[PDB]
Structures are given as structure tokens and as C-alpha cells.
């Protein structure tokens, strides 16, 4: 019932898989479906639920930036907004993933 930022571990896993699928020219929403369908029940119930949450928000909002607001840190939302505008989602997600990893 409460919106929480998706864990760093979940975001790293999600971003890495998304980069792979997006640069195979799979659309973002289709990529999310693929990750789920092939991930149950290899992945944890909560990881699958996190993808369902992203999908639900994409359906109920008018941009990816709005959909991810409240689900990823504000600094990552900002980079998603530039990527959405420039039409470089995959490379934007790749740079976010790099930042998380470099932070360690």
C-alpha cells in the first residue's frame, strides 16, 4: 500500500537485463514482460512484483519519467528524463548502472 524505492540489488539486476534486451531492439514494455515470464519462479516473488509495479505505473502514467518517480532515486529519474527525451534509453540505463557499480 506504500510506494518504496526499489532496492539497489533489484535495480542493478533489472538495469543489466534491460540493457541486453533493449540493444536487441526489444521495446521497453515488451522487455519487462520477457524478464518476468522467464524469471518466474527463478527470481524471488518480490523481484517479479517490482517489475509488475513498473509495468502498472507505465500503464497509469504518460511518461517513463513519471512512471519511475518514487520507484528509483530522484537522481536516476533525472537521467531517465534526459534519455527519454534524447531517445537513448538503453545507454541512459547503462550509465545509471555504471554509476551504481562505480559507487562501490
CATH number of the domain at 67, please: 1.20.81.30
Separation CA 64–CA 37 (nearest Å)? 21
Coarse DSSP helix, strand, coil percentages of the chain, rounded to the nearest 5 percent:
75, 0, 25
Separation CA 53–CA 2 (nearest Å)? 12
- Resolution of this entry, Å: 1.9
From the list 72, 76, 79, 73, the residue with the least C-alpha distance to 57 is: 72
From the list 41, 46, 26, 2, the residue with the least C-alpha distance to 93 is: 26
Separation CA 26–CA 19 (nearest Å)? 10
Separation CA 36–CA 47 (nearest Å)? 9
Contact 38, 26 (CB under 8 A): no
- Residues of the domain holding 49: 1-104
Number of domains in the chain: 1
Q: Is 34 exposed, middle or buried (0-12, 13-18, 19+ CB in 10 A)?
A: middle
Amino acid at each position: 500500500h506504500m510506494m518504496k524505492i526499489i532496492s539497489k540489488k533489484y535495480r542493478l539486476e533489472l538495469y543489466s537485463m534491460l540493457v541486453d534486451l533493449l540493444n536487441d531492439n526489444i521495446p521497453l514494455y515488451d522487455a519487462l514482460n520477457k524478464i518476468q515470464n522467464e524469471g518466474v519462479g527463478i527470481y524471488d516473488k518480490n523481484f517479479i512484483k517490482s517489475i509488475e509495479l513498473i509495468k502498472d505505473r507505465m500503464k497509469s502514467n504518460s511518461s517513463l519519467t513519471d512512471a519511475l518517480t518514487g520507484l528509483i532515486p530522484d537522481k536516476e529519474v533525472l537521467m531517465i528524463n534526459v534519455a527519454e527525451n534524447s531517445g537513448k534509453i538503453s545507454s541512459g540505463i547503462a550509465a545509471i548502472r555504471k554509476n551504481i557499480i562505480d559507487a562501490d
